[PDB]
Design a protein around this ligand. Sequence first.
Ligand SMILES: COC(=O)C1=C(CN2CC(F)(F)C[C@H]2C(=O)O)NC(c2nccs2)=N[C@@]1(C)c1ccc(F)cc1
Ligand SMILES: COC(=O)C1=C(CN2CC(F)(F)C[C@H]2C(=O)O)NC(c2nccs2)=N[C@@]1(C)c1ccc(F)cc1
Ligand SMILES: COC(=O)C1=C(CN2CC(F)(F)C[C@H]2C(=O)O)NC(c2nccs2)=N[C@@]1(C)c1ccc(F)cc1
Ligand SMILES: COC(=O)C1=C(CN2CC(F)(F)C[C@H]2C(=O)O)NC(c2nccs2)=N[C@@]1(C)c1ccc(F)cc1
Ligand SMILES: COC(=O)C1=C(CN2CC(F)(F)C[C@H]2C(=O)O)NC(c2nccs2)=N[C@@]1(C)c1ccc(F)cc1
Ligand SMILES: COC(=O)C1=C(CN2CC(F)(F)C[C@H]2C(=O)O)NC(c2nccs2)=N[C@@]1(C)c1ccc(F)cc1
Ligand SMILES: COC(=O)C1=C(CN2CC(F)(F)C[C@H]2C(=O)O)NC(c2nccs2)=N[C@@]1(C)c1ccc(F)cc1
Ligand SMILES: [Cl-]
Lengths: 150, 143, 148, 143, 150, 143
Amino acid sequence: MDIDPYKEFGATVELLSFLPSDFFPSVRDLLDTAAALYRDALESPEHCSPHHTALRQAILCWGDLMTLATWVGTNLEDPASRDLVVSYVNTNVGLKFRQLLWFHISCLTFGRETVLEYLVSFGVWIRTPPAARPPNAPILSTLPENLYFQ
Amino acid sequence: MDIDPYKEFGATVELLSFLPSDFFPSVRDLLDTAAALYRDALESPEHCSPHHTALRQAILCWGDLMTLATWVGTNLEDPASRDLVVSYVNTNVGLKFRQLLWFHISCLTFGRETVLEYLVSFGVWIRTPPAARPPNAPILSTL
Amino acid sequence: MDIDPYKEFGATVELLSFLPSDFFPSVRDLLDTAAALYRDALESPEHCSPHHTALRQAILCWGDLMTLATWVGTNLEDPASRDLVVSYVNTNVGLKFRQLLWFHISCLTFGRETVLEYLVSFGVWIRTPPAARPPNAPILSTENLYFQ
Amino acid sequence: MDIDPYKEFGATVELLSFLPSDFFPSVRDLLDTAAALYRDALESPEHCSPHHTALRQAILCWGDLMTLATWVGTNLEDPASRDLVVSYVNTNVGLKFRQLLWFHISCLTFGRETVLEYLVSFGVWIRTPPAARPPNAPILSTL
Amino acid sequence: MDIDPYKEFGATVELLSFLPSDFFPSVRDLLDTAAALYRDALESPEHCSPHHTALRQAILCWGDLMTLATWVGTNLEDPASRDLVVSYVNTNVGLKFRQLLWFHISCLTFGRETVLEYLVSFGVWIRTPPAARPPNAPILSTLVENLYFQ
Amino acid sequence: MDIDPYKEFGATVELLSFLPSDFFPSVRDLLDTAAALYRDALESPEHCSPHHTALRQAILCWGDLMTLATWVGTNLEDPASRDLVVSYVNTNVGLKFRQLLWFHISCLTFGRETVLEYLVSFGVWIRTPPAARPPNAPILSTL
Ligand SMILES: COC(=O)C1=C(CN2CC(F)(F)C[C@H]2C(=O)O)NC(c2nccs2)=N[C@@]1(C)c1ccc(F)cc1
Ligand SMILES: COC(=O)C1=C(CN2CC(F)(F)C[C@H]2C(=O)O)NC(c2nccs2)=N[C@@]1(C)c1ccc(F)cc1
Ligand SMILES: COC(=O)C1=C(CN2CC(F)(F)C[C@H]2C(=O)O)NC(c2nccs2)=N[C@@]1(C)c1ccc(F)cc1
Ligand SMILES: COC(=O)C1=C(CN2CC(F)(F)C[C@H]2C(=O)O)NC(c2nccs2)=N[C@@]1(C)c1ccc(F)cc1
Ligand SMILES: COC(=O)C1=C(CN2CC(F)(F)C[C@H]2C(=O)O)NC(c2nccs2)=N[C@@]1(C)c1ccc(F)cc1
Ligand SMILES: COC(=O)C1=C(CN2CC(F)(F)C[C@H]2C(=O)O)NC(c2nccs2)=N[C@@]1(C)c1ccc(F)cc1
Ligand SMILES: COC(=O)C1=C(CN2CC(F)(F)C[C@H]2C(=O)O)NC(c2nccs2)=N[C@@]1(C)c1ccc(F)cc1
Ligand SMILES: [Cl-]
């Protein structure tokens, strides 16, 4: 099976990968923001939206990954091996979940169409030589609805 | 935050806990069954349903967990240590995903109300002394 | 005072005693089932029914008994004596609570008349020689108002 | 499961625990009084009331605890050991049942509203410095 | 800034000082009583009254004072001395909070006017020589021509 | 009892916790600001507002805490142990009172809704990577 978690939301893994890793907040800061803005909906008995359903699973999945990675660290006897697991998590699944958590949080706040336009706008800006581009980054909020019955 | 992945679907972690671990198919068999029955919908650009959205994420999350567990597992020198990872996965996160994958697959096939009733029916049957209960288990599809 | 806990529910200790101890689920499984089926009602501020009121007390009483039995076991010097406490609890008060919890859970699920008939049906079946009786046991399944 | 035995009766464990242990009659005296006032109803085939149903179970539960504690005591050779069991029962589960038996007996005699008001009145009186408060305690039957 | 916590409630520190320390229940007993009588209101999202707002803060402030003293005691010296040195909280600020907690609880129960008059009545009684005064203290809760206008 | 001092004002401890500690002025600067802006109201015989009542108690509570912390500090002139008192205050109760004093002062000046929106705006801004966000912080007074 070949499932792209962005495809039902009108995006792709390749489109999120257009952004450099430095664009994304940390996982902990994304999780804090999801709580600050959406805790009640995420904890509610209501689906709310496909974005809420996906964001719930992504939050819990990161917890699963951290529980496994922590248990692995607990059994490692070499301090350099423990560093290897951390660096493996941060370099691989960490970036994947920063992309994913950011995508759902930003879509819930600003809308898919605005988010996809911002992804392109920032990705083009950061690829322009710094001496040739505007000094500040484009701003997500400065950019210019199905009811999901079941 | 305290998110119960079953709550938006009318269930709870505690309710799935009512079933013994032996009730659930293996993760591999659950994944094979999701593919055999729902591959086209799971891979489509349509949400289809909240169960599809959740099942998509659970399938991908298990992939993430297995890539990590395999990467650790292939690099261990002691077979007692590899048995420790396998036994840790099977006893903990493996059981969580058997519950979760089974819940979404069964709901996609039979509907929430049938699944919740079956959860209780089987959990009650298996707790009845074997000499006092019907020889065969209750059947999910019947009702 | 001589109170039979079944009497207000149309039964007696002697009638529950007609069933062999192997008939009843374990206490842990009865408690799990009470939660799976009746957690919200048992925890609610409403009486719900006389069975709910009695089942609430039985659940908490089992907790009291286990706290006492656990405390006794930890403080006994002789480990063989600790084993005897466990076996004494299981053979005596444990069986009493399996009967009691089963009675209220079954009554809430199937009603008093079905339960009382089933207790006699199973009690008669298990006393029939196995070679002379049906191979499978009888099946139990095959908001009320409460007067006094 | 988290069951508060007072909740269906409009009270809580925390409210009963507002009263110091010395407020409550002994378990033996509560059982004597339950018999003197309510023996026929408690032994009858009728529910009578939710308080009667709960009080029946509380009386029998204390019997279970005493049967267990007595069996333990008869099997302990050391008197100091038997003394500690007696003191443990009275200090812990004994207080729980003094609260519980008193609550049901008082409610059957005076009604829940009167009982709850009295709990607060006595709990406030006993917390007032003795030199600053009325010499006698408030009276349950008044008002 | 010189804030008297009683001034907005029609009293002063000097007036509460008229009562001897023996008059007041203990802090623990005042806190137990606030819960027994006012837990739901104190925990609610409604202001309820100025007395409720002030009492909420006093309860939490006592917690702050005890948390600090306990944390220091846990990391001061070995336990032989650490507990009794920080029993200063009870020795000084303990009376201040007994006054303050009692003031808010009594006002919520009986009203400011009854409380202030009772403060004076008890303070006068306790200052009268015991051999010359009534044996029992005045009572906080205390105080037929309605037939004519029948 | 579980009292959240923000709850009657439409907030929670966890919401204030969304802000980094560096966001808040010092306690001393919050107190000097409360005096410059609200000394007369805070010292008046009128309630003025629920925020005034709460802020009065918080100001006085900090006085209680510092008298205690100084008495604790003055007793043992061992630098490590002394530096633990100030470091415990700075990391724990000092931060609690910076949050609380700021919340009441900002609410008195700009209103609850402006304050709550600003908390989220700044908390989100500071979590955006510095190279990707506007160079200056959002401004509390700008609606
Ligand atoms: C809600 O409980 C029930 O419904 C029960 C059923 C439901 N039955 C379970 C079964 F598999 F045997 C078939 C089914 C039926 O009667 O159709 N059966 C029984 C018993 N049967 C024989 C000895 S105890 N007890 C409970 C009350 C029971 C209570 C607690 C427990 F853990 C197990 C069973
Ligand atoms: C699409 O899935 C199903 O339909 C399933 C059926 C369908 N049933 C399989 C059966 F042979 F037991 C009879 C049939 C029925 O109820 O008529 N049964 C079950 C379970 N039954 C007992 C424990 S798990 N799970 C799934 C969801 C299930 C899911 C994944 C898997 F690998 C196996 C079963
Ligand atoms: C394993 O042994 C026991 O269970 C027992 C021992 C073990 N004792 C040690 C021994 F080996 F010398 C034989 C026996 C004895 O004193 O005769 N002693 C007793 C006593 N009853 C009255 C006075 S002592 N009861 C139990 C059954 C007893 C039962 C429950 C309990 F909690 C404590 C003791
Ligand atoms: C709700 O609190 C009260 O009602 C109180 C009463 C109620 N009175 C208790 C009494 F027994 F003395 C008689 C009764 C009355 O006035 O009729 N009395 C008092 C005090 N009286 C003297 C010194 S403190 N304080 C509180 C506020 C009080 C507050 C907390 C506490 F723990 C004890 C008393
Ligand atoms: C039937 O029970 C009662 O009526 C009771 C009365 C009746 N009062 C006994 C009295 F002497 F104090 C006067 C009388 C009254 O209120 O007029 N009082 C009390 C208590 N009062 C204070 C602490 S417990 N409990 C019971 C429920 C009570 C229950 C069991 C028991 F053993 C003792 C008291
Ligand atoms: C609710 O989230 C947002 O509103 C977000 C904003 C809001 N913007 C933050 C800002 F300071 F850069 C200005 C403001 C705006 O667009 O006006 N911006 C961004 C990003 N911008 C650049 C790289 S990520 N992400 C989130 C979804 C974001 C998500 C989580 C997180 F922790 C930080 C930011
Ligand atoms: C009355 O207090 C205020 O008005 C405040 C202003 C007023 N702002 C100060 C400024 F220079 F940043 C611009 C101005 C504005 O929003 O236009 N800003 C802030 C904060 N801003 C960011 C972190 S705290 N807090 C207070 C409540 C504040 C409270 C106490 C204190 F000491 C400093 C600031
Ligand atoms: Cl794809």
